[PDB]
Paper text:
Cyclic nucleotide binding domains (CNB) confer allosteric regulation by cAMP or cGMP to many signaling proteins, including PKA and PKG. PKA of phylogenetically distant Trypanosoma is the first exception as it is cyclic nucleotide-independent and responsive to nucleoside analogues. Here, we show that natural nucleosides inosine, guanosine and adenosine are nanomolar affinity CNB ligands and activators of PKA orthologs of the important tropical pathogens Trypanosoma brucei, Trypanosoma cruzi, and Leishmania. Substitution of two to three amino acids in the binding sites is sufficient for conversion of CNB domains from nucleoside to cyclic nucleotide specificity.
To evaluate the binding mode, we solved the crystal structures of T. cruzi PKAR(200-503) and T. brucei PKAR(199-499) bound to inosine at 1.4 Å and 2.1 Å resolution, respectively. The structures of TbPKAR and TcPKAR show high overall similarity. Calculated RMSD of Cα alignment was 0.796 Å for the entire proteins and 0.281/0.342 Å for CNB-A and CNB-B, respectively. Residues that contribute to high affinity binding by interacting with the ribose moiety of inosine are identical in both structures and reside in a segment that we denoted ribose binding cassette (RBC), in analogy to the phosphate binding cassette (PBC) nomenclature for mammalian PKA. Likewise, the ‘capping’ by π-stacking with the purine ring in both sites (Y371/483TcPKAR, Y370/482TbPKAR) and the interacting residues in the lid-like αD helix are conserved. Residues G309; E310; E312 and A321 belong to Ribose Binding Cassette A (RBC-A), while G433; E434 and E436 are part of Ribose Binding Cassette B (RBC-B). Capping residues (Y371 and Y483) taking part in a π-stacking interaction with the hypoxanthine ring of inosine are marked with an asterisk. In the ligand-bound structures of TbPKAR and TcPKAR, this helix docks to theβ-barrel of the B-site, covers the binding pocket and shields the ligand from solvent. The high-resolution crystal structures of T. brucei PKAR and T. cruzi PKAR thus provides a molecular rationale for absence of binding and activation by cAMP.
Numbering used by the authors: 213 to 501
The structure:
């Protein structure tokens, strides 16, 4: 199969440089494209066509077999409706139609525009299957059972956990290896699948100081993403460690629903060090790419 996709030539619809930039930004922040390289992202963007909708339009309707398209929303929102009940809200940058393309099933839920207008970029099934889907199902299988047992993700439903899985890769560390170094940009969030880590801050004299430990099910790296600064501690493996790793460019999409659970670092006594870093102004800015 992978050898056959090599022979597939995606369609191209003329794009200005500004349109390519716009679409590429949507794709590089949407989890469905997480592991495509830069050349492939550009081919996929070139294959997309613009579509627009009005309030109350159905982009697709439950039961349809005639869609078979992937829509990435530029702007506007849409309700996901099952059995007449609104169950999810799709917003800018998100995709609709991916469930049907990934799992080869008729449309599962109605997608109904709920803003005045919606603008989307649309990809055909063949380009999705040949260039995008890749190992999506295997990747979901690698992580889903684990994610279902991670405390800070307990509020996400299955759909949201699978969306997070789409953006995860694995990295292992031997004892004494640094997962995060102090003073770095801060673009990786790690969820500990196995092992123990130590958080090493800097004290008032600038010397390393042990802050706390984390272990299986804990996360590190989110503080820089929440508060837009460079890293303020090292994180060092104290045992062999296995992590699932999420890039900052996917954080808003995958973990949006828990952005608040994560702000509760303020209350945790384990984050006294960090709160003092923020209070004293000891970190410089860093924003998502
Ligand atoms: O449970 C869900 N949560 C969020 N979105 C969903 C869910 N089921 C479907 N969709 C979305 O609606 C489209 C049409 O079925 C799917 O492709 C997916 O984007
Ligand atoms: O005070 C703290 N308590 C617990 N973890 C911390 C604290 N400060 C930093 N980190 C952790 O180290 C990473 C890099 O700065 C942060 O993202 C967070 O996971």
């Amino acid at each position: 199969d992978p050898e056959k996709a090599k022979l597939y030539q995606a369609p191209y619809f003329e794009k200005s440089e500004d349109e390519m930039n716009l679409i590429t930004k949507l794709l590089t922040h949407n989890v469905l494209f997480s592991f495509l390289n830069t050349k492939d992202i550009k081919v996929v963007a070139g294959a997309m066509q613009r579509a627009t909708f009005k309030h109350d339009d159905c982009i697709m309707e439950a039961g349809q077999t005639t869609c078979n398209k992937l829509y990435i929303i530029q702007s506007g929102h849409a309700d996901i409706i099952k059995e007449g009940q609104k169950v999810y809200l799709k917003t800018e940058g998100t995709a609709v139609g991916e469930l049907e393309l990934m799992y080869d099933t008729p449309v599962v839920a109605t997608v109904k525009v709920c803003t005045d207008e919606l603008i989307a970029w649309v990809l055909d099934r063949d380009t999705y299957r040949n260039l995008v889907m890749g190992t999506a199902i295997r990747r979901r299988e690698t992580y889903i059972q684990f994610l279902a047992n991670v405390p800070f993700l307990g509020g996400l439903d299955s759909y949201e956990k699978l969306q997070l899985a789409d953006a995860l890769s694995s990295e292992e560390f031997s004892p004494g290896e640094y997962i995060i170094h102090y003073g770095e940009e801060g673009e990786w969030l790690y969820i500990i699948m196995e092992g123990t880590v130590e958080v090493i801050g800097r004290d008032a004299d600038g010397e390393p100081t042990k802050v706390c430990e984390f272990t299986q099910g804990d996360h590190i790296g989110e503080l820089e993403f929440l508060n837009n600064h460079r890293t303020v501690a090292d994180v060092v493996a104290t045992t062999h460690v296995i992590t699932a790793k999420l890039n900052r460019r996917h954080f808003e999409m995958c973990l949006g629903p828990v952005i608040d659970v994560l702000k509760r670092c303020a209350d945790d006594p384990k984050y006294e060090y960090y709160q003092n870093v923020l209070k004293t102004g000891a970190a410089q800015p860093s924003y998502v790419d």
